Amino acid sequence: RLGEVFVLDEEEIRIIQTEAEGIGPENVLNASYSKLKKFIESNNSYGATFSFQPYTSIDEMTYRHIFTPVLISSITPDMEITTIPKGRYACIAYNFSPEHYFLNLQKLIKYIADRQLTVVSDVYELIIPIHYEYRVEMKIRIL
Amino acid sequence: RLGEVFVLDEEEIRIIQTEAEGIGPENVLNASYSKLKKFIESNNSYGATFSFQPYTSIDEMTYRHIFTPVLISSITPDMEITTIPKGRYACIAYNFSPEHYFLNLQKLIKYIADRQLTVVSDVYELIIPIHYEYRVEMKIRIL
Ligand SMILES: [Mn+2]
């Protein structure tokens, strides 16, 4: 159940997110996901969102928004309150590793190409720090 | 039922939206809502989104994203597919007029202050062109 696409029915998650001014996977892979954290320092797990495309290489990618799940007021603009709507999701979870990232993205991409699915959201990249290493849940909404 | 806050339970609307690079109400009031249209020319009604705050003046405001309801593929990034989640909304509809805009915003703002409600989204400004004049539906998600 780790390193393979599954389709689940998620409930809705409330989040706080902001614009990911330029930053992309290429930058996080040149460091740690700790980078995104910085954008949202103003919950415990964080994430990024990016347009779903059949990318042929990381460089083509660029994140759109950095977000964090919530659990509320006194929030400035430049930070938005939204959710990750309840729905059917194609998910692929793995332990973070540069080599893995692109590879898994490809699996998800292929999984949707075949199965001729219809995506209705961006790819959500959820980072979950594992403290005894990162856990990554890549998912995208489908119809 | 026109020019007063009501709370309804909307279903979910699928939309396409983009970043509203700087643009705000102050600019649309100096022209027509036709301005926003331009941002999303790449449905029939369009809209804008902005952070919910107890604004004391239009100038303080700046739009966040311009969007349009949908009804699907071959979409570039720089354009995002999302929704206006189903939920309970505090809505205020009126016929567009510069004088009205701020005034009604105030009503909605007051309505939430009293009633001590909890908003969980940005203010959605839905523009509906009336062709025999504009119709504006200002709404924000509540808990
Ligand atoms: Mn945005």
mmCIF file of C-alpha atoms and ligand atoms in Angstrom:
data_model
loop_
_atom_site.group_PDB
_atom_site.id
_atom_site.type_symbol
_atom_site.label_atom_id
_atom_site.label_comp_id
_atom_site.label_asym_id
_atom_site.label_seq_id
_atom_site.Cartn_x
_atom_site.Cartn_y
_atom_site.Cartn_z
ATOM 1 C CA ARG A 1 0.000 0.000 0.000
ATOM 2 C CA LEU A 2 3.089 2.222 -0.280
ATOM 3 C CA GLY A 3 4.252 3.259 -3.713
ATOM 4 C CA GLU A 4 1.061 2.574 -5.654
ATOM 5 C CA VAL A 5 -2.005 4.496 -6.811
ATOM 6 C CA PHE A 6 -5.246 3.854 -5.015
ATOM 7 C CA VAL A 7 -8.512 5.696 -5.250
ATOM 8 C CA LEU A 8 -10.088 6.710 -1.991
ATOM 9 C CA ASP A 9 -12.947 8.849 -0.870
ATOM 10 C CA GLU A 10 -11.569 11.575 1.287
ATOM 11 C CA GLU A 11 -13.581 13.806 3.558
ATOM 12 C CA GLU A 12 -12.877 17.496 3.397
ATOM 13 C CA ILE A 13 -9.791 19.019 4.960
ATOM 14 C CA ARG A 14 -9.712 22.695 5.983
ATOM 15 C CA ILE A 15 -6.477 24.489 5.144
ATOM 16 C CA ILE A 16 -4.587 27.713 5.160
ATOM 17 C CA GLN A 17 -2.539 28.394 2.086
ATOM 18 C CA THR A 18 -0.575 31.024 0.228
ATOM 19 C CA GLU A 19 0.972 31.771 -3.127
ATOM 20 C CA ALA A 20 4.165 29.836 -3.904
ATOM 21 C CA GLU A 21 5.939 32.700 -5.591
ATOM 22 C CA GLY A 22 7.947 30.803 -8.280
ATOM 23 C CA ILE A 23 9.262 27.963 -6.030
ATOM 24 C CA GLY A 24 9.024 24.383 -7.423
ATOM 25 C CA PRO A 25 10.023 20.748 -6.852
ATOM 26 C CA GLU A 26 13.430 21.472 -8.380
ATOM 27 C CA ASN A 27 14.123 23.746 -5.373
ATOM 28 C CA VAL A 28 12.830 21.348 -2.716
ATOM 29 C CA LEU A 29 14.901 18.548 -4.197
ATOM 30 C CA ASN A 30 17.974 20.763 -3.917
ATOM 31 C CA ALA A 31 17.238 21.010 -0.194
ATOM 32 C CA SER A 32 14.540 19.607 2.030
ATOM 33 C CA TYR A 33 10.835 20.057 2.161
ATOM 34 C CA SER A 34 11.804 22.307 5.032
ATOM 35 C CA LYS A 35 11.779 24.970 2.362
ATOM 36 C CA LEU A 36 7.973 25.033 1.935
ATOM 37 C CA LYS A 37 7.561 25.190 5.723
ATOM 38 C CA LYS A 38 9.025 28.678 5.647
ATOM 39 C CA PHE A 39 6.252 29.969 3.432
ATOM 40 C CA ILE A 40 3.626 28.871 5.827
ATOM 41 C CA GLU A 41 5.209 29.574 9.244
ATOM 42 C CA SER A 42 2.767 32.479 9.836
ATOM 43 C CA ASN A 43 -0.636 22.603 11.842
ATOM 44 C CA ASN A 44 2.238 20.049 11.731
ATOM 45 C CA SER A 45 2.092 18.672 8.141
ATOM 46 C CA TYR A 46 2.335 20.985 5.147
ATOM 47 C CA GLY A 47 1.971 20.758 1.411
ATOM 48 C CA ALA A 48 2.099 22.215 -2.008
ATOM 49 C CA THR A 49 -0.137 22.273 -5.040
ATOM 50 C CA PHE A 50 0.665 22.167 -8.691
ATOM 51 C CA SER A 51 -1.102 22.026 -12.048
ATOM 52 C CA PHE A 52 -1.712 18.496 -13.294
ATOM 53 C CA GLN A 53 0.184 17.864 -16.492
ATOM 54 C CA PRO A 54 2.021 15.005 -18.136
ATOM 55 C CA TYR A 55 5.403 16.526 -17.244
ATOM 56 C CA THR A 56 8.444 15.118 -18.956
ATOM 57 C CA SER A 57 10.848 16.622 -16.434
ATOM 58 C CA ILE A 58 11.147 18.433 -13.124
ATOM 59 C CA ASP A 59 11.942 22.007 -14.102
ATOM 60 C CA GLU A 60 8.795 22.137 -16.082
ATOM 61 C CA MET A 61 7.148 22.176 -12.640
ATOM 62 C CA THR A 62 6.428 25.092 -10.390
ATOM 63 C CA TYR A 63 4.249 25.072 -7.288
ATOM 64 C CA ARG A 64 1.070 27.206 -7.137
ATOM 65 C CA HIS A 65 0.179 27.451 -3.406
ATOM 66 C CA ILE A 66 1.739 26.161 -0.118
ATOM 67 C CA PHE A 67 -0.830 25.138 2.492
ATOM 68 C CA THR A 68 -1.305 23.518 5.915
ATOM 69 C CA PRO A 69 -4.203 21.636 7.422
ATOM 70 C CA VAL A 70 -6.094 23.418 10.213
ATOM 71 C CA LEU A 71 -8.065 22.458 13.344
ATOM 72 C CA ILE A 72 -8.787 30.304 13.359
ATOM 73 C CA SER A 73 -9.407 34.068 13.098
ATOM 74 C CA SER A 74 -6.952 36.928 13.224
ATOM 75 C CA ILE A 75 -5.577 35.863 9.822
ATOM 76 C CA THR A 76 -4.200 38.397 7.397
ATOM 77 C CA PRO A 77 -5.006 38.330 3.719
ATOM 78 C CA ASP A 78 -2.115 36.997 1.665
ATOM 79 C CA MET A 79 -3.168 33.808 3.425
ATOM 80 C CA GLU A 80 -6.336 32.100 2.353
ATOM 81 C CA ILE A 81 -8.777 29.850 4.119
ATOM 82 C CA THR A 82 -10.148 27.016 1.953
ATOM 83 C CA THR A 83 -10.438 23.282 1.927
ATOM 84 C CA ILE A 84 -9.489 20.171 0.069
ATOM 85 C CA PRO A 85 -13.073 19.287 -0.789
ATOM 86 C CA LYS A 86 -14.445 15.905 0.061
ATOM 87 C CA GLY A 87 -14.356 13.632 -3.019
ATOM 88 C CA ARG A 88 -12.780 10.700 -4.850
ATOM 89 C CA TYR A 89 -8.968 10.854 -4.980
ATOM 90 C CA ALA A 90 -6.257 9.017 -6.866
ATOM 91 C CA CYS A 91 -3.506 8.824 -4.227
ATOM 92 C CA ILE A 92 0.077 7.634 -4.220
ATOM 93 C CA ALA A 93 2.045 7.579 -0.982
ATOM 94 C CA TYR A 94 5.738 7.028 -0.497
ATOM 95 C CA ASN A 95 8.754 7.841 1.640
ATOM 96 C CA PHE A 96 10.459 10.908 0.318
ATOM 97 C CA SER A 97 13.476 10.515 -1.881
ATOM 98 C CA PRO A 98 14.583 12.619 -4.831
ATOM 99 C CA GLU A 99 14.716 9.591 -7.094
ATOM 100 C CA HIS A 100 11.170 8.652 -6.084
ATOM 101 C CA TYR A 101 9.432 11.960 -6.536
ATOM 102 C CA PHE A 102 9.402 12.152 -10.338
ATOM 103 C CA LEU A 103 9.040 8.422 -10.652
ATOM 104 C CA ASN A 104 5.856 8.292 -8.629
ATOM 105 C CA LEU A 105 4.477 11.377 -10.311
ATOM 106 C CA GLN A 106 4.816 9.379 -13.487
ATOM 107 C CA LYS A 107 2.886 6.457 -12.046
ATOM 108 C CA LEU A 108 0.043 8.727 -11.028
ATOM 109 C CA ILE A 109 0.140 10.394 -14.386
ATOM 110 C CA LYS A 110 0.027 7.030 -16.148
ATOM 111 C CA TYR A 111 -2.678 5.743 -13.883
ATOM 112 C CA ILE A 112 -4.935 8.574 -14.935
ATOM 113 C CA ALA A 113 -4.030 8.372 -18.683
ATOM 114 C CA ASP A 114 -5.013 4.715 -18.768
ATOM 115 C CA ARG A 115 -8.274 4.298 -16.812
ATOM 116 C CA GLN A 116 -9.107 7.458 -18.801
ATOM 117 C CA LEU A 117 -9.979 9.419 -15.697
ATOM 118 C CA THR A 118 -11.101 13.009 -15.367
ATOM 119 C CA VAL A 119 -9.198 15.169 -12.857
ATOM 120 C CA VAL A 120 -10.989 18.191 -11.289
ATOM 121 C CA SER A 121 -8.279 19.745 -9.139
ATOM 122 C CA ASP A 122 -4.557 20.294 -8.919
ATOM 123 C CA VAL A 123 -2.158 17.714 -7.675
ATOM 124 C CA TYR A 124 -1.956 18.072 -3.906
ATOM 125 C CA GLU A 125 1.425 17.225 -2.433
ATOM 126 C CA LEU A 126 1.036 16.492 1.267
ATOM 127 C CA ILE A 127 4.201 16.346 3.344
ATOM 128 C CA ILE A 128 4.057 14.466 6.599
ATOM 129 C CA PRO A 129 7.176 14.563 8.684
ATOM 130 C CA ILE A 130 7.880 11.165 10.287
ATOM 131 C CA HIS A 131 9.762 11.625 13.578
ATOM 132 C CA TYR A 132 10.832 8.432 15.346
ATOM 133 C CA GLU A 133 12.250 11.063 7.052
ATOM 134 C CA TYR A 134 9.283 12.435 5.090
ATOM 135 C CA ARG A 135 6.079 10.891 3.989
ATOM 136 C CA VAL A 136 4.543 12.169 0.796
ATOM 137 C CA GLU A 137 0.977 11.794 -0.267
ATOM 138 C CA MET A 138 0.397 12.889 -3.859
ATOM 139 C CA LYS A 139 -3.292 13.070 -4.747
ATOM 140 C CA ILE A 140 -5.600 14.675 -7.236
ATOM 141 C CA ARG A 141 -9.343 14.920 -7.417
ATOM 142 C CA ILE A 142 -11.242 12.841 -9.960
ATOM 143 C CA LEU A 143 -14.843 12.593 -11.247
ATOM 144 C CA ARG B 1 -34.764 39.375 -1.179
ATOM 145 C CA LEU B 2 -32.456 41.857 -2.933
ATOM 146 C CA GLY B 3 -30.086 43.900 -0.832
ATOM 147 C CA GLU B 4 -30.109 41.783 2.321
ATOM 148 C CA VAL B 5 -28.047 38.986 3.856
ATOM 149 C CA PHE B 6 -29.515 35.524 3.834
ATOM 150 C CA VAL B 7 -27.902 32.240 4.692
ATOM 151 C CA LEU B 8 -28.346 29.467 2.195
ATOM 152 C CA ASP B 9 -26.977 26.028 1.635
ATOM 153 C CA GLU B 10 -25.262 25.998 -1.688
ATOM 154 C CA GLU B 11 -24.221 22.921 -3.592
ATOM 155 C CA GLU B 12 -20.738 22.881 -5.009
ATOM 156 C CA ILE B 13 -19.803 24.863 -8.088
ATOM 157 C CA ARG B 14 -16.834 23.843 -10.260
ATOM 158 C CA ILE B 15 -14.690 26.737 -11.447
ATOM 159 C CA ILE B 16 -11.643 27.816 -13.324
ATOM 160 C CA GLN B 17 -9.694 30.618 -11.756
ATOM 161 C CA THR B 18 -6.446 32.532 -11.863
ATOM 162 C CA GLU B 19 -4.352 34.959 -9.880
ATOM 163 C CA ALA B 20 -5.653 38.543 -9.816
ATOM 164 C CA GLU B 21 -2.267 40.176 -10.074
ATOM 165 C CA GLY B 22 -2.836 43.327 -7.926
ATOM 166 C CA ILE B 23 -6.264 44.326 -9.381
ATOM 167 C CA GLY B 24 -9.006 45.309 -6.865
ATOM 168 C CA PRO B 25 -12.512 46.758 -6.491
ATOM 169 C CA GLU B 26 -11.067 50.264 -6.792
ATOM 170 C CA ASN B 27 -10.138 49.403 -10.410
ATOM 171 C CA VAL B 28 -13.456 47.782 -11.329
ATOM 172 C CA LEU B 29 -15.329 50.755 -9.923
ATOM 173 C CA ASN B 30 -13.251 53.029 -12.144
ATOM 174 C CA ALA B 31 -14.538 51.019 -15.104
ATOM 175 C CA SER B 32 -16.845 48.060 -15.443
ATOM 176 C CA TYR B 33 -16.676 44.528 -14.240
ATOM 177 C CA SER B 34 -15.701 43.972 -17.844
ATOM 178 C CA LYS B 35 -12.203 44.336 -16.483
ATOM 179 C CA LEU B 36 -12.173 40.982 -14.633
ATOM 180 C CA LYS B 37 -13.551 39.264 -17.746
ATOM 181 C CA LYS B 38 -10.248 39.932 -19.467
ATOM 182 C CA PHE B 39 -8.331 37.896 -16.929
ATOM 183 C CA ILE B 40 -10.421 34.881 -17.546
ATOM 184 C CA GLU B 41 -11.050 35.011 -21.324
ATOM 185 C CA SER B 42 -8.748 31.984 -21.862
ATOM 186 C CA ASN B 43 -18.771 30.157 -18.809
ATOM 187 C CA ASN B 44 -20.920 33.343 -18.971
ATOM 188 C CA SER B 45 -20.767 34.726 -15.384
ATOM 189 C CA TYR B 46 -17.447 35.518 -13.732
ATOM 190 C CA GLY B 47 -16.194 36.521 -10.332
ATOM 191 C CA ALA B 48 -13.497 37.526 -7.978
ATOM 192 C CA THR B 49 -12.357 36.512 -4.532
ATOM 193 C CA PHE B 50 -10.966 38.530 -1.708
ATOM 194 C CA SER B 51 -9.856 38.098 1.897
ATOM 195 C CA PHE B 52 -12.629 38.680 4.418
ATOM 196 C CA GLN B 53 -11.843 41.649 6.606
ATOM 197 C CA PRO B 54 -13.717 44.476 8.263
ATOM 198 C CA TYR B 55 -12.502 46.962 5.639
ATOM 199 C CA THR B 56 -12.957 50.624 6.376
ATOM 200 C CA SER B 57 -12.454 51.655 2.758
ATOM 201 C CA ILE B 58 -12.090 50.421 -0.802
ATOM 202 C CA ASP B 59 -8.385 50.769 -1.519
ATOM 203 C CA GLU B 60 -7.644 48.542 1.368
ATOM 204 C CA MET B 61 -9.057 45.836 -0.921
ATOM 205 C CA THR B 62 -7.314 43.812 -3.558
ATOM 206 C CA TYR B 63 -8.674 40.747 -5.325
ATOM 207 C CA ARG B 64 -6.941 37.352 -4.931
ATOM 208 C CA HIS B 65 -8.242 35.197 -7.836
ATOM 209 C CA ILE B 66 -10.647 35.750 -10.806
ATOM 210 C CA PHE B 67 -12.752 32.699 -11.654
ATOM 211 C CA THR B 68 -15.619 31.408 -13.818
ATOM 212 C CA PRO B 69 -18.090 28.609 -13.301
ATOM 213 C CA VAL B 70 -17.661 25.553 -15.541
ATOM 214 C CA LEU B 71 -19.884 22.858 -17.091
ATOM 215 C CA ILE B 72 -12.735 20.613 -19.529
ATOM 216 C CA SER B 73 -9.213 19.378 -20.361
ATOM 217 C CA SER B 74 -6.515 21.010 -22.429
ATOM 218 C CA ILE B 75 -6.072 23.659 -19.713
ATOM 219 C CA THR B 76 -2.717 25.251 -19.071
ATOM 220 C CA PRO B 77 -1.362 25.796 -15.600
ATOM 221 C CA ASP B 78 -1.620 29.423 -14.538
ATOM 222 C CA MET B 79 -5.295 28.491 -14.517
ATOM 223 C CA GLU B 80 -6.600 26.300 -11.759
ATOM 224 C CA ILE B 81 -9.488 23.905 -11.516
ATOM 225 C CA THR B 82 -11.299 23.966 -8.152
ATOM 226 C CA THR B 83 -14.726 24.460 -6.724
ATOM 227 C CA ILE B 84 -16.792 26.598 -4.445
ATOM 228 C CA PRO B 85 -17.447 23.786 -1.990
ATOM 229 C CA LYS B 86 -20.955 22.916 -1.000
ATOM 230 C CA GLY B 87 -21.813 24.518 2.370
ATOM 231 C CA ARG B 88 -23.695 27.184 4.315
ATOM 232 C CA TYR B 89 -23.304 30.693 2.862
ATOM 233 C CA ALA B 90 -24.101 34.199 4.026
ATOM 234 C CA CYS B 91 -25.182 35.847 0.758
ATOM 235 C CA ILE B 92 -26.090 39.368 -0.257
ATOM 236 C CA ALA B 93 -27.322 40.065 -3.772
ATOM 237 C CA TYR B 94 -27.828 43.393 -5.458
ATOM 238 C CA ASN B 95 -27.775 45.256 -8.753
ATOM 239 C CA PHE B 96 -24.351 46.660 -9.363
ATOM 240 C CA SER B 97 -23.684 50.263 -8.553
ATOM 241 C CA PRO B 98 -20.529 51.874 -7.209
ATOM 242 C CA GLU B 99 -22.401 53.387 -4.291
ATOM 243 C CA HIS B 100 -23.845 49.976 -3.420
ATOM 244 C CA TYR B 101 -20.723 47.874 -3.490
ATOM 245 C CA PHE B 102 -19.042 49.122 -0.310
ATOM 246 C CA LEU B 103 -22.355 49.648 1.389
ATOM 247 C CA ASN B 104 -23.441 46.057 0.975
ATOM 248 C CA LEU B 105 -20.017 44.753 1.887
ATOM 249 C CA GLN B 106 -20.573 46.563 5.145
ATOM 250 C CA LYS B 107 -23.922 44.883 5.693
ATOM 251 C CA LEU B 108 -22.391 41.469 5.170
ATOM 252 C CA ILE B 109 -19.527 42.383 7.412
ATOM 253 C CA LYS B 110 -21.919 43.564 10.117
ATOM 254 C CA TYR B 111 -24.136 40.561 9.707
ATOM 255 C CA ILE B 112 -21.240 38.287 10.519
ATOM 256 C CA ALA B 113 -19.893 40.452 13.418
ATOM 257 C CA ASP B 114 -23.263 40.315 15.144
ATOM 258 C CA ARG B 115 -24.588 36.734 14.916
ATOM 259 C CA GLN B 116 -20.947 36.023 15.846
ATOM 260 C CA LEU B 117 -20.424 33.757 12.874
ATOM 261 C CA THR B 118 -17.323 31.893 11.798
ATOM 262 C CA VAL B 119 -16.239 32.336 8.162
ATOM 263 C CA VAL B 120 -14.183 29.545 6.495
ATOM 264 C CA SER B 121 -13.471 30.974 3.054
ATOM 265 C CA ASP B 122 -12.862 34.198 1.203
ATOM 266 C CA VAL B 123 -15.596 36.487 0.085
ATOM 267 C CA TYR B 124 -16.752 35.298 -3.325
ATOM 268 C CA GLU B 125 -17.937 38.058 -5.625
ATOM 269 C CA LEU B 126 -20.096 36.572 -8.365
ATOM 270 C CA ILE B 127 -20.889 38.784 -11.335
ATOM 271 C CA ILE B 128 -23.910 37.906 -13.398
ATOM 272 C CA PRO B 129 -24.486 40.025 -16.441
ATOM 273 C CA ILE B 130 -28.200 40.800 -16.909
ATOM 274 C CA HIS B 131 -28.986 41.295 -20.614
ATOM 275 C CA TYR B 132 -32.558 42.307 -21.439
ATOM 276 C CA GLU B 133 -26.785 45.943 -15.855
ATOM 277 C CA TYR B 134 -24.903 43.626 -13.484
ATOM 278 C CA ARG B 135 -26.048 41.379 -10.744
ATOM 279 C CA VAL B 136 -23.690 40.818 -7.861
ATOM 280 C CA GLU B 137 -23.796 37.992 -5.413
ATOM 281 C CA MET B 138 -21.399 38.481 -2.507
ATOM 282 C CA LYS B 139 -21.072 35.369 -0.352
ATOM 283 C CA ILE B 140 -18.734 33.791 2.125
ATOM 284 C CA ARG B 141 -18.631 30.373 3.679
ATOM 285 C CA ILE B 142 -19.627 29.930 7.313
ATOM 286 C CA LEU B 143 -19.530 27.123 9.920
HETATM 287 MN MN MN C 1 -3.683 31.586 -5.754
#
